[PDB]
Design an enzyme around this catalytic site. Sequence first.
Site, PDB file in Angstrom:
ATOM      1  N   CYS A 161       0.926  -1.211  -0.066  1.00 39.30           N
ATOM      2  CA  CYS A 161      -0.028  -0.101  -0.110  1.00 39.30           C
ATOM      3  C   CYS A 161       0.892   1.215  -0.119  1.00 39.30           C
ATOM      4  O   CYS A 161       1.679   1.404   0.902  1.00 39.30           O
ATOM      5  CB  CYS A 161      -1.030  -0.138   1.220  1.00 39.30           C
ATOM      6  SG  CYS A 161      -2.060   1.508   1.178  1.00 39.30           S
ATOM      7  N   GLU A 208      -5.019   3.450 -10.686  1.00 42.29           N
ATOM      8  CA  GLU A 208      -5.767   2.137 -10.478  1.00 42.29           C
ATOM      9  C   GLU A 208      -6.917   2.051 -11.335  1.00 42.29           C
ATOM     10  O   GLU A 208      -7.217   0.894 -11.944  1.00 42.29           O
ATOM     11  CB  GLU A 208      -6.301   1.989  -8.861  1.00 42.29           C
ATOM     12  CG  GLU A 208      -5.165   1.894  -7.970  1.00 42.29           C
ATOM     13  CD  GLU A 208      -5.693   1.981  -6.437  1.00 42.29           C
ATOM     14  OE1 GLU A 208      -6.082   0.816  -5.910  1.00 42.29           O
ATOM     15  OE2 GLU A 208      -5.892   3.151  -5.994  1.00 42.29           O
ATOM     16  N   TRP A 247      -9.488   6.044  -0.678  1.00 43.14           N
ATOM     17  CA  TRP A 247      -9.762   6.763  -1.972  1.00 43.14           C
ATOM     18  C   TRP A 247      -9.013   6.111  -2.915  1.00 43.14           C
ATOM     19  O   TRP A 247      -7.848   5.543  -2.583  1.00 43.14           O
ATOM     20  CB  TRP A 247      -9.877   8.273  -1.833  1.00 43.14           C
ATOM     21  CG  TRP A 247      -8.206   8.795  -1.339  1.00 43.14           C
ATOM     22  CD1 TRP A 247      -7.157   8.659  -1.915  1.00 43.14           C
ATOM     23  CD2 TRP A 247      -7.936   9.372  -0.108  1.00 43.14           C
ATOM     24  NE1 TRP A 247      -6.230   9.156  -1.078  1.00 43.14           N
ATOM     25  CE2 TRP A 247      -6.801   9.603   0.102  1.00 43.14           C
ATOM     26  CE3 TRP A 247      -8.811   9.492   1.062  1.00 43.14           C
ATOM     27  CZ2 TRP A 247      -5.962  10.140   1.102  1.00 43.14           C
ATOM     28  CZ3 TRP A 247      -8.288  10.062   2.168  1.00 43.14           C
ATOM     29  CH2 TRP A 247      -6.905  10.368   2.133  1.00 43.14           C
ATOM     30  N   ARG A 256      -0.186   4.414   2.879  1.00 39.58           N
ATOM     31  CA  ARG A 256       0.033   4.287   4.241  1.00 39.58           C
ATOM     32  C   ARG A 256       0.365   5.485   5.047  1.00 39.58           C
ATOM     33  O   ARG A 256       0.171   5.156   6.470  1.00 39.58           O
ATOM     34  CB  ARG A 256       0.975   3.090   4.651  1.00 39.58           C
ATOM     35  CG  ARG A 256       0.505   1.879   4.269  1.00 39.58           C
ATOM     36  CD  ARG A 256       1.589   0.816   4.672  1.00 39.58           C
ATOM     37  NE  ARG A 256       2.693   0.560   3.563  1.00 39.58           N
ATOM     38  CZ  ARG A 256       3.851   0.045   3.700  1.00 39.58           C
ATOM     39  NH1 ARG A 256       4.121  -0.496   4.868  1.00 39.58           N
ATOM     40  NH2 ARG A 256       4.750   0.020   2.603  1.00 39.58           N
TER      41      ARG A 256
HETATM   42  C1  HEM Z   1      -6.362   6.485   1.478  1.00 35.30           C
HETATM   43  C2  HEM Z   1      -6.466   6.014   0.335  1.00 35.30           C
HETATM   44  C3  HEM Z   1      -5.588   4.676  -0.232  1.00 35.30           C
HETATM   45  C4  HEM Z   1      -4.778   4.914  -1.438  1.00 35.30           C
HETATM   46  C5  HEM Z   1      -4.901   5.840  -2.321  1.00 35.30           C
HETATM   47  C6  HEM Z   1      -4.277   3.232  -1.333  1.00 35.30           C
HETATM   48  C7  HEM Z   1      -3.637   2.970  -2.391  1.00 35.30           C
HETATM   49  C8  HEM Z   1      -3.159   1.768  -2.472  1.00 35.30           C
HETATM   50  C9  HEM Z   1      -2.693   1.153  -3.679  1.00 35.30           C
HETATM   51  C10 HEM Z   1      -2.621   1.890  -5.210  1.00 35.30           C
HETATM   52  C11 HEM Z   1      -2.745  -0.209  -3.875  1.00 35.30           C
HETATM   53  C12 HEM Z   1      -2.149  -1.023  -5.079  1.00 35.30           C
HETATM   54  C13 HEM Z   1      -3.448  -1.487  -5.638  1.00 35.30           C
HETATM   55  C14 HEM Z   1      -2.887  -2.610  -6.720  1.00 35.30           C
HETATM   56  O1  HEM Z   1      -2.016  -2.150  -7.580  1.00 35.30           O
HETATM   57  O2  HEM Z   1      -3.331  -3.570  -6.931  1.00 35.30           O
HETATM   58  C15 HEM Z   1      -3.134  -0.394  -2.281  1.00 35.30           C
HETATM   59  C16 HEM Z   1      -2.639  -1.868  -1.666  1.00 35.30           C
HETATM   60  C17 HEM Z   1      -3.419  -1.981  -0.663  1.00 35.30           C
HETATM   61  N1  HEM Z   1      -3.851  -1.070   0.227  1.00 35.30           N
HETATM   62 FE1  HEM Z   1      -4.105   0.736   0.197  1.00 35.30          FE
HETATM   63  N2  HEM Z   1      -4.669   2.676  -0.553  1.00 35.30           N
HETATM   64  C18 HEM Z   1      -5.322   3.402   0.594  1.00 35.30           C
HETATM   65  C19 HEM Z   1      -5.906   3.333   1.743  1.00 35.30           C
HETATM   66  C20 HEM Z   1      -5.743   1.769   2.280  1.00 35.30           C
HETATM   67  C21 HEM Z   1      -6.417   1.556   3.252  1.00 35.30           C
HETATM   68  C22 HEM Z   1      -7.654   2.380   4.409  1.00 35.30           C
HETATM   69  C23 HEM Z   1      -6.013   0.188   3.611  1.00 35.30           C
HETATM   70  C24 HEM Z   1      -6.615  -0.594   4.560  1.00 35.30           C
HETATM   71  C25 HEM Z   1      -6.709  -0.406   6.085  1.00 35.30           C
HETATM   72  C26 HEM Z   1      -5.385  -0.218   2.625  1.00 35.30           C
HETATM   73  C27 HEM Z   1      -4.747  -1.491   2.499  1.00 35.30           C
HETATM   74  C28 HEM Z   1      -4.207  -1.798   1.285  1.00 35.30           C
HETATM   75  C29 HEM Z   1      -3.834  -3.294   1.250  1.00 35.30           C
HETATM   76  C30 HEM Z   1      -4.091  -4.393   2.061  1.00 35.30           C
HETATM   77  C31 HEM Z   1      -3.442  -3.419  -0.158  1.00 35.30           C
HETATM   78  C32 HEM Z   1      -2.888  -4.622  -0.894  1.00 35.30           C
HETATM   79  C33 HEM Z   1      -4.183  -5.395  -1.167  1.00 35.30           C
HETATM   80  C34 HEM Z   1      -3.712  -6.733  -1.926  1.00 35.30           C
HETATM   81  O3  HEM Z   1      -2.502  -7.476  -1.759  1.00 35.30           O
HETATM   82  O4  HEM Z   1      -4.148  -6.951  -3.103  1.00 35.30           O
HETATM   83  N3  HEM Z   1      -5.138   0.957   1.857  1.00 35.30           N
HETATM   84  N4  HEM Z   1      -3.238   0.794  -1.680  1.00 35.30           N
HETATM   85  N1  V5D Z   2      -7.377   2.778  -3.405  1.00 34.37           N
HETATM   86  C1  V5D Z   2      -7.111   1.526  -2.700  1.00 34.37           C
HETATM   87  C2  V5D Z   2      -7.469   1.648  -1.257  1.00 34.37           C
HETATM   88  C3  V5D Z   2      -7.263   0.501  -0.613  1.00 34.37           C
HETATM   89  C4  V5D Z   2      -6.790  -0.522  -1.218  1.00 34.37           C
HETATM   90  C5  V5D Z   2      -6.431  -0.484  -2.648  1.00 34.37           C
HETATM   91  C6  V5D Z   2      -5.760  -1.750  -3.396  1.00 34.37           C
HETATM   92  C7  V5D Z   2      -6.829  -2.957  -3.124  1.00 34.37           C
HETATM   93  C8  V5D Z   2      -6.877  -3.587  -4.385  1.00 34.37           C
HETATM   94  C9  V5D Z   2      -6.868  -5.209  -4.329  1.00 34.37           C
HETATM   95  N2  V5D Z   2      -5.972  -6.075  -5.446  1.00 34.37           N
HETATM   96  C10 V5D Z   2      -6.661  -7.270  -5.538  1.00 34.37           C
HETATM   97  C11 V5D Z   2      -5.705  -7.986  -6.326  1.00 34.37           C
HETATM   98  C12 V5D Z   2      -5.009  -9.201  -6.204  1.00 34.37           C
HETATM   99  C13 V5D Z   2      -4.268  -9.924  -7.177  1.00 34.37           C
HETATM  100  C14 V5D Z   2      -3.737  -9.235  -8.379  1.00 34.37           C
HETATM  101  C15 V5D Z   2      -4.309  -8.142  -8.490  1.00 34.37           C
HETATM  102  O1  V5D Z   2      -4.066  -7.458  -9.792  1.00 34.37           O
HETATM  103  C16 V5D Z   2      -3.588  -6.116  -9.819  1.00 34.37           C
HETATM  104  C17 V5D Z   2      -1.929  -6.170  -9.873  1.00 34.37           C
HETATM  105  C18 V5D Z   2      -1.581  -5.030  -9.136  1.00 34.37           C
HETATM  106  C19 V5D Z   2       0.141  -5.156  -8.866  1.00 34.37           C
HETATM  107  C20 V5D Z   2       0.817  -6.365  -9.595  1.00 34.37           C
HETATM  108  C21 V5D Z   2       2.215  -6.186  -9.238  1.00 34.37           C
HETATM  109  C22 V5D Z   2       2.901  -7.090  -9.863  1.00 34.37           C
HETATM  110  C23 V5D Z   2       2.191  -8.220 -10.686  1.00 34.37           C
HETATM  111  N3  V5D Z   2       2.943  -9.074 -11.108  1.00 34.37           N
HETATM  112  N4  V5D Z   2       0.946  -8.059 -10.593  1.00 34.37           N
HETATM  113  C24 V5D Z   2       0.058  -6.987 -10.103  1.00 34.37           C
HETATM  114  C25 V5D Z   2      -1.378  -7.186 -10.320  1.00 34.37           C
HETATM  115  C26 V5D Z   2      -5.299  -7.438  -7.852  1.00 34.37           C
HETATM  116  N5  V5D Z   2      -6.777   0.574  -3.355  1.00 34.37           N
END
Ligand code: HEM
Ligand code: V5D
Lengths: 362, 362
Positions: free
Chosen positions: B65, B242, B237, B68
């Site tokens: 994330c 994304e 947000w 954070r």
């Molecule tokens: C405040 C606005 C926030 C922004 C802009 C943000 C931004 C991001 C982004 C861009 C990703 C990667 C998404 C991807 O490429 O798949 C991410 C991953 C993540 N964020 Fe945040 N985030 C925010 C808030 C939060 C909050 C509130 C939480 C939980 C308390 C959180 C927990 C996570 C987690 C757990 C992931 C990884 C999910 C996964 O493994 O698929 N984020 N965040």
């Molecule tokens: N605003 C916010 C706020 C809170 C949380 C988030 C992000 C949550 C998105 C959950 N995500 C699920 C997921 C799981 C497995 C694959 C996925 O595909 C997208 C992806 C992203 C990065 C990669 C980096 C390397 C790679 N080899 N693959 C990727 C695939 C999504 N956003």
Amino acid sequence: EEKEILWNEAKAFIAACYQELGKAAEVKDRLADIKSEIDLTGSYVHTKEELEHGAKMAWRNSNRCIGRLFWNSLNVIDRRDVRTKEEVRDALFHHIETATNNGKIRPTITIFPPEEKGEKQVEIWNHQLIRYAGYESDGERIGDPASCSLTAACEELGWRGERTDFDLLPLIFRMKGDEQPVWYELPRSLVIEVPITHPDIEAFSDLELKWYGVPIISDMKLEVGGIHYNAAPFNGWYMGTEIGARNLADEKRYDKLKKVASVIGIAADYNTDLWKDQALVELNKAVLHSYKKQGVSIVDHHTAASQFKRFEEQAEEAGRKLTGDWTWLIPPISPAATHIFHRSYDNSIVKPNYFYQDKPYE
Amino acid sequence: EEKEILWNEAKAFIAACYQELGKAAEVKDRLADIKSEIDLTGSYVHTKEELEHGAKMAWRNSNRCIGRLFWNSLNVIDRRDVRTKEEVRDALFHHIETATNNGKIRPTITIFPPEEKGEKQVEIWNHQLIRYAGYESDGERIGDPASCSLTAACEELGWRGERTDFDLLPLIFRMKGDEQPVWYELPRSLVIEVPITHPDIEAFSDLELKWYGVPIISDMKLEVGGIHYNAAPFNGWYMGTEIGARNLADEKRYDKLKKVASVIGIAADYNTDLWKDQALVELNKAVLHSYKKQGVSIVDHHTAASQFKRFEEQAEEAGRKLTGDWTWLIPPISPAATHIFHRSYDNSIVKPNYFYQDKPYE
Ligand code: HEM
Ligand SMILES: Nc1cccc(CCCCNCc2cccc(OCc3ccc4ccc(N)nc4c3)c2)n1
Ligand code: HEM
Ligand SMILES: Nc1cccc(CCCCNCc2cccc(OCc3ccc4ccc(N)nc4c3)c2)n1
Ligand SMILES: [Cl-]
Ligand SMILES: [Cl-]
């Protein structure tokens, strides 16, 4: 002073190298010749064909290289016979000319004598055979900041740059036995350069940008069968992003994005305007257009990723495990628009390969 | 049926949690209360403040994330008291409304009762509370292909989508004891959506693109002190990339780059024109412009990386090790234009944290 680990690496390399060349039957005799030779001298000498193929295998195993599809057509130049400074200089001069090939760049490597005792026979100081100098005295920054330490070392040895933003650094290398390296100015006729223009934006030439045609990495050690070729400069052609997204875009390099935004007529005030993103794309479009218009080989990162997918497929058909470094294989421009981004890669190190080595200068 | 590993995780969490809250003296009494409670029931119940802080710590430890920096202002909603389907539905309805906040999005998490025996009290099937349906029958593709399996499971249970490209999926979750989940249609008044327009290119609206305002991840398990909160939907947000670089750009998603290139008046024939790159930038500019013009919170990837640098600095001043996943922290648009690209990160997993869990549907 034994502890010959070299015998084990030779067993592994010769077996695989002869396996791929169809010379599988010739292995036991050659390893016998090697084991005696190791006992008599403490080392062994590669053949002609082991050396050429080992250099190709080393390219094939380079986890960070996206252009590995053409590993088998690498042009290997064997100069283990060199003994003097003038022969080293002439070989480096020749590498530039034959790799450049009037713009139709040939992937080429020149292989100098390997380390004997771990003692270098030839020690190249250049990061690339062709690179620009960098200066950094009281506030004023000139040239390529990445070359500041090497540019200082050269000037400490008698060289002097004109302090343009694109001073060609001299070739600089040390021979075994000498306390100091020698340096030779590069003949302008050997170095092709490309002025950066834009296909649509005529004002882009006001930036007065340019880059050299051929990247010839000259500071990496080629390791084949336990033999350490510390001096083995290699080259391919550029991928456009290397120039437009890093060399000319990095803040610690030429840092041109602000000036690019101004000539393409967009403001550089707000992050949400994505002006860095837009300028990066127009600059990278300009680099590809410029190299193509001049007739100098280049590849875009989309085509390069397409070729690397076929390298992945080709590796699987040949029964070879594929290795790679995801963090280096993805391009710095639209990485998610390539297949590389959407899979993983095993970053295991397989030999032969190319490896970093400590700079000789400070 | 013991083997209580839970006692060790509770010792680690309570010590650190109370350490940060200044309640360091209250630790031995609380762990004593916990150890008895573990012996009497096989589990223990977090307080009010341990739960809220543990959810904040879990966000702070999310290696992937980039946002954070604001971990400490997470709005924690405690609904461990829920017992019925209507109370679960109402809590999910409430989360959407209070997180949305008329566009001024509040990072919020609603925490449902944890797993007791490893047995779920509430099992949410949605990946996000708000997501679009996807269809895929004989040649014709409609909606979001990433939602095809969930959309099929919903329709197998009586739901039917209008088969637009942006059908809102219903909330779907199963209670403990029931063989089947229940589904509830989302009230349109709760879901803010943003039509995608371009600041300069008026024809961009011809693409008829839109996205939802608030991403509310609802399929991850929050683990705090050995207690597994499998149902704890959270939201922040959006970062613009994304939506503009993945949700609308991926070939396996909405796959709009070709149509974007046509409305912005560039050809999509040659790789060396970098048309995918240019279209990606204009589309991402459009997403930010659209959310800002509507008044829905969003952040660009440059500003987001700037905030994450301060999170890095803030972590070092607090004496906490920083952990992160470089491959997920870099944005998919101009990653090398951010500091994240140019350093490394330790990908160690520290608890509390959020973790993947197996989908309940096929
Ligand atoms: C405040 C606005 C926030 C922004 C802009 C943000 C931004 C991001 C982004 C861009 C990703 C990667 C998404 C991807 O490429 O798949 C991410 C991953 C993540 N964020 Fe945040 N985030 C925010 C808030 C939060 C909050 C509130 C939480 C939980 C308390 C959180 C927990 C996570 C987690 C757990 C992931 C990884 C999910 C996964 O493994 O698929 N984020 N965040
Ligand atoms: N605003 C916010 C706020 C809170 C949380 C988030 C992000 C949550 C998105 C959950 N995500 C699920 C997921 C799981 C497995 C694959 C996925 O595909 C997208 C992806 C992203 C990065 C990669 C980096 C390397 C790679 N080899 N693959 C990727 C695939 C999504 N956003
Ligand atoms: C044919 C044209 C070639 C292209 C387009 C190409 C492309 C690339 C690119 C883009 C990188 C990453 C650069 C960076 O981000 O820092 C790379 C790395 C590398 N390439 Fe290639 N390459 C080519 C030929 C070769 C050849 C001929 C060799 C040697 C036989 C080679 C060996 C390597 C090595 C060793 C690295 C990693 C260097 C390091 O760790 O710093 N490549 N290649
Ligand atoms: N056409 C061709 C043909 C042949 C070879 C090449 C590439 C050779 C370039 C040598 N390279 C030296 C170097 C070493 C250490 C850092 C460097 O900085 C650039 C960079 C690139 C990728 C990164 C990925 C992740 C990360 N954290 N940093 C990175 C830094 C360059 N090209
Ligand atoms: Cl370079
Ligand atoms: Cl999303």
